[PDB]
Symmetry: C2
Subunit: 269 residues, 2 copies
């Protein structure tokens, strides 16, 4: 129950946590807590909530729950449901009008501007220590930023999307595959007033949202991808450019995968 | 005694510590310890020993001494004499063949090379966080380097000189000011075997060094000057260039002042 719920939450970020399997294999509390924390941190890299500056942890509780914490303080328990977790994260976020986090990944300190010319950024990569840039536009509606902490360089590529927008996209993917042109016309007609999701479920927009409130996809979706480099590669400009391409490609891949999976779930409604 | 000795030690770095005055005004131990530590840190910026990475402190002892510590550990006491202090610092130093410290000021981490083009260095100054460069050659036989820690940018300009070399220069200034050309010619004769100091004092090289072993100038001299910037000026390339010029000018000034003072001390011999 709880473990399967955590696994489904992780799948919205493209993370295969296999917590249910681990628990089914008689793994101990330390092992489960470590796998939970690692999976949560990876998911935080994908959800695009903008909480890189916080320490994310997950652990088993006495009464059989999974507690999710940020900076050592309890945020929510899996038993409360996915919406409760999203609401717990909400007041910690600071998103701009484009849906990009305004928080720095390194926290308090100087941050390079988003429009920093690529040559100057190459100077930072080769010869600085810790550094961070703000968001800049990237190829094809994406945004990107980069920061280095210690020995690790982080390249983040994002394409913001609300969970509702992703749900609407998956529902439209289901509607577009309907071969019966008459039924598809009816779905188009319902979509005019109620939108994609309500049309697919034959209800008003809010009624469809209420029917889907139980899915983690109703509150979390893939918005970004973080590619890392370490050692000498963390100081190499060409390795950074390659990491940027890898990050963009992985972002497109994960968004496509999670959208297709969500569409396959929707079809049964 | 002890306080005046500390003041004369400070004068070899061009630091007017006025510790004897403070102690003569019945200032308490806290006030004296703070003035001692502040004067010592300033002197460390001038002596060119290369110990920026260490915390330097000085404090009063129960028995009336002044204890000098690095990184909280006792290094020497003023009662032991100036040579003892220089010897205590010796194993902590790492000087290259030019007399420049090989230690980084920020410690363990990446350091930009000395030959970094100024355009890239301007990128570090404007958009990096902490950073450091190695030594590079500068105008008028000087060397320079720059580093930033937190909110402060440090610009160091050096023109290395051993205490023996500075003593030889002061002795040569005294010899060069002599009007009796026969006497001056004889001193120039002695200088071939005994050096400038030995010639001036009418003794062998070692005998002159022994006669001067009690002065702090026999072990410490002005080798560098550190100019600092903070706030927005610490991130401004024009303020950095101006700080570099100020540092070079102050270095030339202090070396001239200390050389003239040393020459007037040597004139009595």
């Amino acid at each position: 129950g709880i473990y399967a719920a955590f696994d489904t939450l992780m799948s919205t970020a493209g993370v295969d946590s296999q917590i249910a399997a681990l628990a089914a294999s008689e793994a101990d509390a330390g092992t489960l807590d470590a796998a939970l924390t690692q999976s949560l941190q990876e998911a935080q890299g994908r959800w695009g909530l903008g909480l890189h500056h916080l320490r994310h942890e997950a652990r088993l509780t006495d009464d059989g729950d999974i507690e999710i914490l940020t900076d050592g303080r309890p945020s929510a328990r899996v038993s409360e449901g996915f919406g409760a977790l999203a609401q717990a994260y909400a007041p910690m976020q600071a998103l701009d009008e484009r849906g990009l986090s305004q928080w720095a990944a390194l926290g308090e300190g100087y941050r390079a501007p988003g429009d920093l010319p690529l040559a100057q950024l190459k100077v930072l990569i080769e010869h600085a220590r810790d550094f961070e840039t703000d968001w800049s536009a990237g190829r094809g509606e994406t945004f990107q930023r980069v920061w280095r902490k210690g020995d690790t360089l982080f390249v983040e590529v994002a394409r913001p999307a609300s969970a509702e927008a992703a749900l609407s996209k998956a529902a439209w993917k289901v509607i577009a595959s309907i071969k019966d042109r008459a039924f598809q016309r009816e779905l188009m007609r319902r979509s005019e007033k109620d939108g994609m999701l309500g049309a697919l479920l034959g209800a008003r927009h809010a009624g469809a949202k209420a029917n889907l409130a139980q899915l983690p996809e109703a509150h979390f979706t893939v918005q970004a991808f973080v590619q890392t480099l370490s050692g000498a590669a963390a100081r190499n400009a060409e390795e950074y450019r390659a990491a940027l391409k890898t990050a963009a490609a992985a972002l497109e891949e994960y968004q496509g995968v999670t959208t297709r999976q969500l569409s396959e779930v929707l079809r049964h409604g």
